[PDB]
Structures are given as structure tokens and as C-alpha cells.
Write a protein that binds this DNA or RNA. Structure first.
Lengths: 163, 135, 131
RNA sequence: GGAGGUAUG
RNA sequence: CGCAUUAGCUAGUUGGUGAGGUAACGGCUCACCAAGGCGACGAUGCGUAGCCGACCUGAGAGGGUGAUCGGCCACACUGGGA
RNA sequence: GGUACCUAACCAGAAAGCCACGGCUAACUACGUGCCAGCAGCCGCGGUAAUACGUAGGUGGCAAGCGUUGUCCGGAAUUAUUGGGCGUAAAGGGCUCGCAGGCGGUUUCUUAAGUCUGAUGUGAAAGCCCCCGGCUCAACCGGGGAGGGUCAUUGGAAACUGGGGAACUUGAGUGCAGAAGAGGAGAGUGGAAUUCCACGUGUAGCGGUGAAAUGCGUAGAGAUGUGGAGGAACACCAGUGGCGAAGGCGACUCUCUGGUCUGUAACUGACGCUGAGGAGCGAAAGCGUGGGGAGCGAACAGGAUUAGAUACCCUGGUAGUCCACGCCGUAAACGAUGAGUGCUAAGUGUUAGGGGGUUUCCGCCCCUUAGUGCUGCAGCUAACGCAUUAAGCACUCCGCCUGGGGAGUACGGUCGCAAGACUGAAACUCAAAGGAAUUGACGGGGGCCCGCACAAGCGGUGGAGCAUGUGGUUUAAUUCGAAGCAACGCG
RNA sequence: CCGAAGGUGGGACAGAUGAUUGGGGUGAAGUCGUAACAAGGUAGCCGUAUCGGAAGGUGCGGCUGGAUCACCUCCU
């Protein structure tokens, strides 16, 4: 995916001050986690370290732009329920009715709102570590099957699939 | 567990317990039994009024009272605010609320209830210290 | 010992599918054979052969992969198990993956998919989900 | 080149 | 509803014959026969509680409550009797 | 009740407080205070610059209310049916046998208990939900419906579960033919070595330690040769080798005896799996009775070491270790990994078989079972790692876990001669305890390397007199600063 | 005849209280040692027995959740 053609918004999920101990004291760095997305079905996340916070955030954006994925979206919701699982991060994502809006936790919300999903239910069922919740969310979103492509794979019409 | 195991011996919930057990017990004088009645406050008589040292990292002389409640329980209650008028035999009203750094102090004395005077010269959050509005 | 042949057959497919095998051979039974036939009719497997022998027969199932070697069958779950049977009312027959997958219900009309059983207003034992 | 055995602060 | 750190309980007890009694079937009571009945699918014992429509909570499954109003039950200083 | 309601006149006049403002969490400054006074739901504030204490100003959230406490649900997937786990974080019973129970291979017929379905009946009113209407609105009130059950009566369907009958052979077992094995019990036998006893030769120490001593020795030790007594254990073989359910089993021979593996398709034809409670087995220590007793060795004695040394070290040494019977029933009883079954890349050793390929063979190569190791895909895991011997993918059954202490404790019960074992809490208390991995630091850990670091030398200091600085003390003041290296002829 | 209450008696069960006593928990700075964490300076831990002011020591058996250096197999 070329991020130049997409109009990508950036959202700063978290900035953790981490420390490497050395003789004399402690080398602090900042680990920024940022999600970016076009709000039209593409979303990605990246992680950047640096000694200053602005530079950390800049490096996260470049990383995120490298790893964009395409989230299948039926109308304003997801095609079907899925449980995004990654390590201990375990996010359930359920399709919702029109006008429900995005009902998700903090980090999960960033991913879904930047992906441009308008109506979706979610619930974090495992660890709330931001990095792993995001990884679980994108793993789950990456497993969503669109009805049209399923029909092609199974050799049927969409009429037969939906029934 | 297996479904069959669950049938034979079900699940058992964790038994959560009250933070203020002394307030959850009444006393019937006729039967000389403790009743199980939850109360927001209990009346008591001060048997001892003094000061305790807090556990570290804190340091102070924290004013407390040993109170015998109407249900016969003896509890230590913390006296909030600056200065107080409690002595032995002072009748006081206690409420729930631990003092984090005072081991075994699990209740507060309500300022401005029964014998406990309001706090002198208190002007903000007066309602919490039983001080009437000055003019 | 063997306690759920249906579950065991589903697992053979799941495991073979996971490593993108072309075919697998399952020991046959009437009920397993009916499930296999549904998978073909619904386009989850390529073909199913029934080989006779002195014993109970063998079902050779040919798995189906799209372009880019993509697995058509994403997952299989056993629902009704020997330890806990699952029967559904006609109106409570489940849809699987929001209608993108199927459920196989054993009914007095026969071994049907969820859609087929629903059209007949029939319930029964919910054997498996396939998506 | 890697695994297994045989005094106070 | 809880407890197995409650495992055996029952002797009109469980059936039968007959009689008595009841608005009425019935060990409901008696007399005489037999030894049966209940229990690990939790009897018995202990503890706890009026039950419900409903009320509070929860996405739901559930959890808690059983005040006001309605239904049923039980009680009337304590025990028994008519 | 002259109440509601209506009309008229006068008057902004009588009618705003509570909590909070460090983060979670919307809302910051000044002063006082100085680990005191106090605050606190949690992290935590406060020890002379407090946005956390108290006050004041301002701001924020609500508002005739506002806070605190108490109780219930949620968040809590934190008892997980929906919807969790048990290698190392809490959690697999020490292991087997097995009653009840749970679960169960394939075909066909039948039945209709479970299962699905048609109709009928019923689930009061109020309440919740939907739609209307009346109180000036709202609360509230009223009308009409909807909704609600492992519900009952009566028909139907037969795929699955259950019951009955008849078949099938893969599971399981039997027969037949082979194979290995420290599997067990009993009875014998053998060689080495230690100790002791007797004797010959022989003389001054032997033994022990970091160094010594206690101890043994001229009463002839230790060393050396021959023979004998007795007890315990079985070098080499010997191997992530074998066998066993586990504990465990290692000299040889014989007696009795269990199990596993391979081939065969002769036979039975689902006869199977798991298994609470129960029964049996279960290292070492320990216990009872009676034997035995070389070595070893709790306790204990003495010699050392040490500030002390109720220890490590040394010289002795009792129970015990051994045997028979009985009891005890616990281990880091460990693979910290329950049993059964099936499925899912390979490479490579090794143990016991079978079949074959060129053969007298040897052998090499190929295949196949069943074990036992290593590496390693997919997959799994928090990570470490597991990976056809799963910690992967599934299904059946059993056991067990729900923060750390209190505590494997108290009470009760069962068992035991006793020691104790099994079962097994709570009050109270903390906001952690913990797993894996990472960065550094450290080690009386290892490796490598360097330095007036040591070594190889030279001359000093510490002693004396005095100069100077410092500490202490004395002073009216003995001004102030510097305090291991890195303060002290220093500013 | 049946029959409440009451009386006598011995047991069962539950609670309260009790001289004295036993550990347990928690506490801003106490005393004695230094048992564990590195090879923690005698590797540690588990069961058991015995001994000792105290941590603990020792014996028998077991485990690696043991450091350092040598040797035999396995794997790369």
C-alpha cells in the first residue's frame, strides 16, 4: 500500500518512558505507539523509539505507514464477529447496527476509528497492554472475510451464501 | 472442568467480606445474641483516647479512640480534623472508613455527631467535619 | 478410545487443511458420509470418494484451495459432543459467521445445513459449524 | 560448534 | 436455599385384614398380621428462610432482593383443647 | 375545603448551598505550616519554595440539594454453561486394581424415552415493552395490545441419543509361532576390599590437617607374608542401555512367577475407556518384637578453628544402616507434565523383533512394528521452550487451582503403639507475592589484558625537636569554608 | 383411654464467660548472631530423625529449581 495516495490521519496511542540501566545511571528513551489510517478502510500501527518525544512520534508514523492493512467493511460495520487474538491480547469484535457508533476501549478505538468503521461492538477479553491490544485488533480485523470473496472461493453466488 | 465434573460438584464463588465488620452486627439484649443487621453508623462510648504512630513512610501522632459499640464490639476509630474534645466516656458515632497507615484502625468518628464537636475554625469542606457555617 | 467419530473426522479435515494437503482418507460411516456430502454441495471440499472394503469403508476427501493457495475452509468446530448434546429449536437454528458459514443439523428430515433446515421449520441436533 | 551423563552497614 | 468437618434414617415406621373416625380418600386412629419403606438421583441432622407476581442490576446468561401494591400461606401474650 | 383553579393590585423586594481542583478526573495560584499539624478511594502528600495539609482568591461538577458511610449489581472472563486454567506464575492425586457413575466402533430392522414439529389449553390484576388519550409540562393516571413455560392434552417425523433383535471386524481379548529384559519371591554359591584374631619377618614412628593437636605405637605399632572369623555391598561389563504401574531393580546358579513386544490371521465379536468412595503397592528416616553388627555413622566425648563455634575440619563413636514379622504411608514420590484414543513435515542415533533386497555368509542397503534420546517445520507459549515420547489439533473420564501471609495451622472426624498422616478452616493482615526475559551492577565464579598493582630495588613517613594545617578543648571572640580515596603547607 | 404444662434423671447439641496458657499478625530507628540470595564463602531445597540461645547443624534418602574445571555420548 502506498501511503502517499491515502489521506492518513495519525493518532498518538501512548508514549512510555523506558530505561536502559548503565554504569552511573539510567538511559531514558521514549517509545511512542501510533496508529494511522485513511478512515476509508486502511489502518496501520507503528512503534518508534527516540531520546526526545517528538522524534519518537515521527519514527512511529513512518513505521506505521509501512504496515498498512485493508480492513473489510460491510456498509458501516464488519462482515461478521471475530475474536482478534495476539499473545495475551484478546479482542472480540462484533458487527453492530446503524447508529450504534464505535463502542470500544481506548487503544482498540483508535484502530477502529482510524480504519473508518462507524458501528461496531468490541470487548477486550485479555491483557490491556496497548501494544498487544492493537496487535490483537489488527490480527482480528485481518481475518474478516467479505461475503463477495467467500462466494468466489466456494464457487457460489452471493444469493446462495446469504440465503 | 468436564461437564460431568461440573454437574457433580459445581462452581463455588469467592466469599467477599465486609471492610467494616463491626457495623454489620447488631445485638439483642433479650436473647444475648448478635443480630446480622448492616448499619451506616454505630453509637459507642470512648474507653480510651490517645495517639498512635503511623507506619512508615509516615510519621505523626494520630488521634484515635478505642470505642465500645452498642453491639458489644470494641473498635479503634480515627478522629479526623484538627483538635477534638473526646475523653473517656464520651459518646461518639462511628462510620466506616479505614485509616491506611494506622494498623487496626478501620472506622472513623463522625465529627459533629453526639458528643464529638465540630472542628474549630474549619472553613472548607465543613460538612465533612461537622462545622456549622460561620457568619 | 474413540468417543466422537464426527469430531475425529472434523479434526482430520482441520489438521489436513492446516498443512494444505490435497486429500485425506477418513474411515467411513453413514453419518460421516452425509456430512462429507454437504461439504461438497456447499463448496467446502472439492470431491468425496467412498471406497468399499471388508471393513467399514474409507472416505477420501479432496480439499479445496483458491488462487494463492488460500484455504477455503477457515475453521471447523464440533458443537454437539458425547459429553454434552446440543439440540436446537427450528427458530433457534444458528447462523454461522453471520451467514457466511454453515451449520450442520441432524433432523428427522435428514442431515441438513442450517439454511435448509430453517426453510423446513425443522430443528434437531446441531452437529458442527463450518466456516 | 552446541546439550546430556559420569561478621556487620 | 447452605453444610458430608451431617451417612445412614424409620418402628404406625412400610404394606395387608378388619373396625372406628372424617364433608372426603387415606395409618387419619386403633386391634391383629407380615417386614417392609426412604437414602449417595443426598435420606437423616444442623443451619437459614414466609413463597410468588414482581423490584434492582447486567449485553445476555446470571446475581441480589421479596419493602410499598396484588395472590397464597402462617400467627394473634406462651402451650393445649374443644 | 372556601382547598385546587381563576382574576386584580403592590414589591426584585423575602428565597443558594454543598463537594472538589497532583494523576485516575472537569477544574490553579498566594500565604501559613515544616514527616509537626494534618490529608488519603488507589498511586501516595507533608522533614523551610506543598497546584495533595489549613486558610484565602479563582476555577470546576452538581444544585434545594450536596457530600460521607452502609448495603446490592456491574465493571470482575475474579468460579469462565455462555466464558478461564493446571511444564516453570496457584493448580496432575506417589502409583496401580477396581464397585457405582460418566462416556463409547460399523451395517441393518424395530421402538419412540430423549429430540424436532402441528393444533388445542393455560401462564389473574397491577408492573416491564409497544401504541394511543387526561392532568398547563413532567412525574403520575387511564384504555387497547404485545410478551413470557426444560407447562399439560392430543397427532405426526425418525437423522442423532436411549431400549430391543439380527449381523460385521478394525477396538479389546484368546489361540498358535517367535524375541529381549538389573521385573518379582525363595534357596544356594562365588571373587575383590575394609575391620578383627593368630603367627613369621621386621623397628620407631603411624595417623591426620590449611597448620596442628586429640588418638594409636617399644606392652613392638604402621609396613609385610600365610591362614582364619564375621558383616555389608556386588569393580570391569555399564551404554540419555534394559525391565517395572510407581517406589524401584545391577555378582553367578537353580525353583516359583508377572508383564511387555513382534508375526500370524485360527477363534470370540464392542466384551471397551475413565474411575469419586474403596482396596492393594509405595525411597529414606522412624516405630515394636527378636536376631545380626565389618564398614559407615544422627546423638555424644575429645582435639582444633573462631570474637563466640552448641558447625564446617580431625580422632573416636551410640541408635541406625543389615535380617524375619508387623506398623508407619510421607519425599524436589519430578518429565515440577493424569489416563485413553485418533490426526498433524522431516533429519539423525540407539534397544528388541519382522519382512525384502545381490548372497553360504559376513555384512551394506531398503521397509516395517514397538520403545528410548537429539535436532527441527506447521502449530502452540508471557517468555523460556514443546514439537509423532507435544506443552500442537481434537473427543471421553478423573484430580486439582481462584492474591500473599495466617497455614498445611486451629477445631472436629478417621487412621496410628508412637512419631504423626489424611481431611482442613476462619478471625486478623498486606497491596502486593509471583513467572519469564532484558539492561547494568556485583560474586571469597571463569577466561583474557593492562597499570610503581605486585614483584625486583632506592629513599622515606610512623619515633625525636621544630614549621604548618586539621580535630578536640578552651575562650569575649578563638570569623567562615574544605571531611576516605577525591578535607587536613587546602580557599 | 388420650392428653398441655410441670417434676425427676442421664445424655446430645449450641453459645457466653474463665485464673492461667500457646503460638500468630502488625508496629521510625532495640539486642544477639548472619541462616538464604554469587561456588553466599560448608551448593541449595524436599521428606524424616536427632541436637542446639536463634537463625540453624548433623545423619539417611531424594531433586537440579547447583557454580568451576576435567572425561564419555548426542546434536549442529
Amino acid at each position: 500500500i502506498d501511503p502517499s495516495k491515502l489521506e492518513l490521519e495519525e493518532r498518538l496511542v501512548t508514549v512510555n518512558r523506558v530505561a536502559k540501566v548503565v554504569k552511573g545511571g539510567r538511559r531514558f528513551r521514549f517509545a511512542a505507539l501510533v496508529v494511522v489510517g485513511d478512515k476509508n478502510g486502511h489502518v496501520g500501527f507503528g512503534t518508534g523509539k527516540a531520546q526526545e518525544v517528538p522524534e519518537a512520534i515521527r519514527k512511529a508514523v513512518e513505521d506505521a505507514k509501512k504496515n498498512l492493512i485493508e480492513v473489510p467493511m460491510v456498509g458501516t460495520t464488519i462482515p461478521h464477529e471475530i475474536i482478534g487474538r495476539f499473545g495475551a491480547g484478546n479482542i472480540l469484535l462484533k458487527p453492530a447496527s446503524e447508529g450504534t457508533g464505535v463502542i470500544a476501549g481506548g487503544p482498540v478505538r483508535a484502530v477502529l476509528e482510524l480504519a473508518g468503521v462507524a458501528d461496531i461492538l468490541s470487548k477486550s477479553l485479555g491483557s490491556n497492554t496497548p501494544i498487544n491490544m492493537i496487535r490483537a485488533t489488527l490480527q482480528g480485523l485481518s481475518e474478516l472475510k467479505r461475503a463477495e470473496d467467500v462466494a468466489k472461493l466456494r464457487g457460489k453466488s452471493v444469493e446462495e451464501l446469504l440465503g | 472442568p468436564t461437564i460431568n465434573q461440573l454437574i457433580r460438584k459445581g462452581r463455588v464463588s469467592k466469599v467477599e467480606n465486609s471492610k467494616s465488620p463491626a457495623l454489620n452486627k447488631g445485638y439483642n439484649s433479650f436473647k444475648k445474641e448478635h443480630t446480622n443487621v448492616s448499619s451506616p453508623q454505630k453509637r459507642g462510648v470512648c474507653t480510651r483516647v490517645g495517639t498512635m504512630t503511623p507506619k512508615k513512610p509516615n510519621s505523626a501522632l494520630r488521634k484515635y479512640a478505642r470505642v465500645r459499640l452498642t453491639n458489644g464490639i470494641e473498635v479503634t476509630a480515627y478522629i479526623p480534623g484538627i483538635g477534638h474534645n473526646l475523653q473517656e466516656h464520651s459518646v461518639v458515632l462511628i462510620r466506616g472508613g479505614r485509616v491506611k497507615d494506622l494498623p487496626g484502625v478501620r472506622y472513623h468518628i463522625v465529627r459533629g455527631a453526639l458528643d464529638t464537636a465540630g472542628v474549630e475554625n474549619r472553613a472548607q469542606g465543613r460538612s465533612k467535619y461537622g462545622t456549622k457555617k460561620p457568619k | 478410545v474413540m468417543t466422537d467419530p464426527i469430531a475425529d473426522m472434523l479434526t482430520r479435515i482441520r489438521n489436513a487443511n492446516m498443512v494444505r494437503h490435497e486429500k485425506l482418507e477418513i474411515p467411513a460411516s453413514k453419518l460421516k458420509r452425509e456430512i462429507a456430502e454437504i461439504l461438497k454441495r456447499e463448496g467446502f471440499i472439492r470431491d468425496v470418494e467412498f471406497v468399499e472394503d471388508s471393513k467399514q469403508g474409507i472416505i477420501r476427501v479432496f480439499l479445496k484451495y483458491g488462487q494463492n493457495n488460500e484455504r477455503v475452509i477457515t475453521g471447523l468446530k464440533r458443537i454437539s459432543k458425547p459429553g454434552l448434546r446440543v439440540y436446537a429449536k427450528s427458530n433457534e437454528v444458528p447462523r454461522v459467521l453471520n451467514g457466511l458459514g454453515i451449520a450442520i443439523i441432524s433432523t428427522s428430515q435428514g442431515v441438513l445445513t442450517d439454511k435448509e433446515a430453517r426453510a423446513k421449520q425443522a430443528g434437531g441436533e446441531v452437529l458442527a459449524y463450518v466456516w
